[PDB]
Amino acid sequence: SPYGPEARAELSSRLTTLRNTLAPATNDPRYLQACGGEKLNRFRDIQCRRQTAVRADLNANYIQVGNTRTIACQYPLQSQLESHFRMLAENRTPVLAVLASSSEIANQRFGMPDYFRQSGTYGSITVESKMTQQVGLGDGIMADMYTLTIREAGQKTISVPVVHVGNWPDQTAVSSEVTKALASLVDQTAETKRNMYESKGSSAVADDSKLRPVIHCRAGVGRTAQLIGAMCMNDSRNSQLSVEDMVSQMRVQRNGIMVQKDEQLDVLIKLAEGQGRPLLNS
């Protein structure tokens, strides 16, 4: 009954109203606007909530779902790489979860720079990429891991662990089991890195805007929001947070597209049902 078709229809009803309400108008005061002709949004209709924006020149948002703090963003445009690396470094990023497939990255028509699998130089920043483990997530889905070492003259050098799932197709939902395994790996990777900073006495431990996992796919609304939803359900602090809560929270803090496809919502619903977590707010 609480996960039956009636509840699911009501959940979709409430979220569909929120999605349409949050659709961006022209020059919408709720959304970050391109500065002076330079492309900001990878997709014209997938925009960045202004009040939770991380940087004025990125399509990227601070997201807090219940207690779980993350950053969701689009795949950075080529012009945005320097700012993107600065965001990663200032955030002391404990894990960067990239869900864009290798074929997407390879397709030059899509303009998705290969910024974490190769070393490169972007403005004042030089990035060293090293390969580390590879972790199977199930159903043949593979997480390839890396460290990005971000260097800049006069700046503290920051190394960012990277979890790249290279065979999760766009506009699809991998199974609840694969999502659960990926969420565990991302959470685990961030906890190892966060612990390091804590053992070092980093001042970023006391900063709510820092030490946030950064998650992106291509647009930062589909596979990205599925993972963020799964991660928030692994947080023991989020007892009783509903699926309506978590999707509504992602949408108000980024855009109305968060959790783009019904199959992505269905993964979140199945994970909630496994935990006895409510779909609907009373």
Swiss-Prot record:
<protein>
    <recommendedName>
        <fullName>Tyrosine-protein phosphatase YopH</fullName>
        <ecNumber>3.1.3.48</ecNumber>
    </recommendedName>
</protein>
<keyword id="KW-0904">Protein phosphatase</keyword>
<dbReference type="GO" id="GO:0005576">
    <property type="term" value="C:extracellular region"/>
</dbReference>
<dbReference type="GO" id="GO:0004725">
    <property type="term" value="F:protein tyrosine phosphatase activity"/>
</dbReference>
<keyword id="KW-0378">Hydrolase</keyword>
<feature type="active site" description="Phosphocysteine intermediate">
    <location>
        <position position="217"/>
    </location>
</feature>
<comment type="function">
    <text>Essential virulence determinant. This protein is a protein tyrosine phosphatase. The essential function of YopH in Yersinia pathogenesis is host-protein dephosphorylation. It contributes to the ability of the bacteria to resist phagocytosis by peritoneal macrophages.</text>
</comment>
<keyword id="KW-0843">Virulence</keyword>
<feature type="domain" description="Tyrosine-protein phosphatase">
    <location>
        <begin position="1"/>
        <end position="275"/>
    </location>
</feature>
<keyword id="KW-0614">Plasmid</keyword>
<keyword id="KW-0964">Secreted</keyword>
<comment type="similarity">
    <text>Belongs to the protein-tyrosine phosphatase family. Non-receptor class subfamily.</text>
</comment>
<comment type="subunit">
    <text>Monomer.</text>
</comment>
